């Protein structure tokens, strides 16, 4: 009887990406039990922001192929579903994008909304081959917390659209792995303490420490479901 | 349950049943726990967890 | 394209239609996507008024089985390219290899 | 020459890798096969057919 | 609405015996089910606070592989009685207790002296029979708080220690239904005790067990 509690030590990063997070003090079992817990709530659930729908100035359907532009309307989606967008205050942003010449358009092109920043401003969209050609559009970026598709949002609506909106389905979810390990952890006197190493890599988009709180916190939720049984 | 044309059984257990049930029921002659004594079943499952 | 194939698959994606092959080599000198125009060598110049090639790549269009037949560029502008080599990813095309 | 290929990167040469488990967070007993197989997607799609 | 989740609202709380127990709960969130299900698992087995028995002595027999007259059981045999003998014990830590009786007839659990704070719950369990009037059998048993299940291998006879009050848990998770959305985790307690405390307090005390655990993380 008479056990410890966890504390939370040595927030390492060895890029923007991908860190690993350390628990210092642990009891002989709760290793595994909590690792597993934090990687699949980590995994499931995490609040993310990523980008819905896709306005271009003379595009009428995708499956078309703008003039000057190298790729399809449809590659231009598949690259914009990969943009790495932290939004600070609000829901819904509505990026611009302006560009002309001959060269890649790349995300640092975006017009500086302010409190949106883009996390990765290397990030290729398109190629522009030609002195007069120009692309023109308006990004939508929500924030949402699951993995949506195009037509549950499409049956959701049912009521009208125009013509030139192109549906991209969303992907929001900031973290891609996680693994985690027990090792033999160093408090005096004892040498049954366990300590927990969480190695993960995320997309850049939020913080480790707040999500360790945040699953923490809806693991929380569900225990006090729990404890006031009848 | 039992077949028209012979008195056997239709509803014999197929190959994946047939590899985790024999999987379960053998022996091996040095494992964790060897040779300890049992009060019911759900003990030892209780060990195996 | 596939990691573990045979050595096979450049001439069965080249040696059907689905792809463009460049006639005479030469230069890139204008790609967008839809169509390909190539400068062509001096040295494969017929001398009466050779100019250049134009390839217009299908598009979006409908084949037999009700699938989508599509091509797209696979070369960057300025670059150099030789005769009888690959220009448009088909369908199910990889830089000139089958790839399903 | 599999062997020497899998011996190149720092890969195990039985091809068989400890996996663990999504569900219990445990560890499946025997070493697993696991490796990268091309497949393909026939056309035989099920809104087709009900 | 991106923090909000679903919260559950159960259904029953159907017992079968004074210490069987099955507890459903519907709807959680789609992965829900194996999360709960497998920490309520792992604690419930692996660390609770009991009381149990961990050494016995003979005052007749001083080994294991070796025999007793007048017992139709054995010395093994009555170890393993001695497993499964069920007590709770106040504030103390630990405490010896002594048995003994001569005559003919099943020497079962109430025949233990009382010792006063201990308490046995099942003054029906059978510990051995003896056969002859002038068999008597007399020993020595340590009761002591533990806090899980510890083999005979890593530890006067020693015997080994079962301290956690339950005896079976085992989950299922199975489709439930919000009438729009498609599937919800349902999810199954199925368990037992060993009559030291009702099956309901168990797992309120593992949930519990492990909000403290995470507490030092709730903090926001």
């Known amino acids: ?230 | 349950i039992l077949s028209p044309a012979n008195g056997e059984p239709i509803i014999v257990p197929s190959q994946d049943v047939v590899l985790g049930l024999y999987y379960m029921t053998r022996d091996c002659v040095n494992a964790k726990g060897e040779g300890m004594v049992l009060t019911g079943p759900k003990e030892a499952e209780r060990l195996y967890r | 394209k596939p990691l573990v194939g045979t050595g096979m698959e450049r001439a069965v994606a080249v040696d059907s239609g689905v792809t463009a092959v460049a006639k005479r080599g030469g230069v890139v000198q204008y790609v967008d996507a839809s169509r390909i125009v190539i400068k062509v060598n001096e040295d494969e110049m017929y001398p009466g008024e050779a100019g250049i090639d134009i390839y217009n790549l299908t598009k979006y269009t409908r084949s037999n089985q009700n699938t989508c037949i599509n091509q797209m560029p696979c070369v960057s502008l300025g670059e150099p390219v030789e005769r009888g080599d690959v220009l448009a990813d088909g369908p199910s095309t990889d830089l000139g290899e089958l790839a399903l | 020459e599999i062997k020497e290929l899998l011996k190149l990167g720092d890969l195990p040469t039985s091809g068989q890798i400890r996996l663990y488990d999504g569900r219990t967070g445990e560890q499946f007993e025997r070493p697993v096969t696991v490796g990268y197989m091309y497949m393909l997607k026939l056309n035989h799609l099920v809104d087709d057919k009900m």
Do not use: W
């Open chain 1, 1 to 230: 009887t008479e056990f410890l509690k966890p504390r939370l030590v040595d927030i390492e990063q060895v890029s923007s990406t991908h860190a690993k997070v350390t628990l210092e003090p642990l009891e002989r079992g709760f290793g595994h039990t909590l690792g597993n817990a934090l990687r699949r709530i980590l995994l499931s659930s995490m609040p993310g922001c990523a980008v819905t729908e896709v306005e271009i100035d003379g595009v009428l359907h995708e499956y078309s192929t703008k003039e000057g532009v190298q790729e399809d309307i449809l590659e231009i989606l598949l690259n914009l579903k990969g943009l790495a967008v932290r939004v600070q205050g609000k829901d819904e942003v509505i990026l611009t994008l302006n560009k002309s010449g001959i060269g890649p358009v790349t995300a640092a092109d975006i017009t500086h909304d302010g409190d949106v920043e883009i996390v990765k401003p290397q990030h290729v969209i398109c190629h522009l081959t030609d002195e007069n050609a120009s692309i023109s559009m308006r990004i939508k970026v929500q924030r949402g917390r699951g993995y949506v598709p195009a037509s549950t949002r499409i049956h959701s609506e049912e009521d009208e659209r125009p013509i030139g909106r192109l549906l991209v389905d969303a992907c929001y979810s900031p973290v891609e792995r996680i693994a985690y390990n027990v090792e033999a952890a160093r408090v005096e006197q004892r040498t049954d303490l366990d300590k927990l190493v969480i190695e993960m890599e995320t997309n850049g988009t939020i913080d480790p420490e707040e999500a360790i709180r945040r699953a923490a916190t809806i693991l929380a939720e569900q225990l006090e479901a729990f404890v006031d049984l009848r």
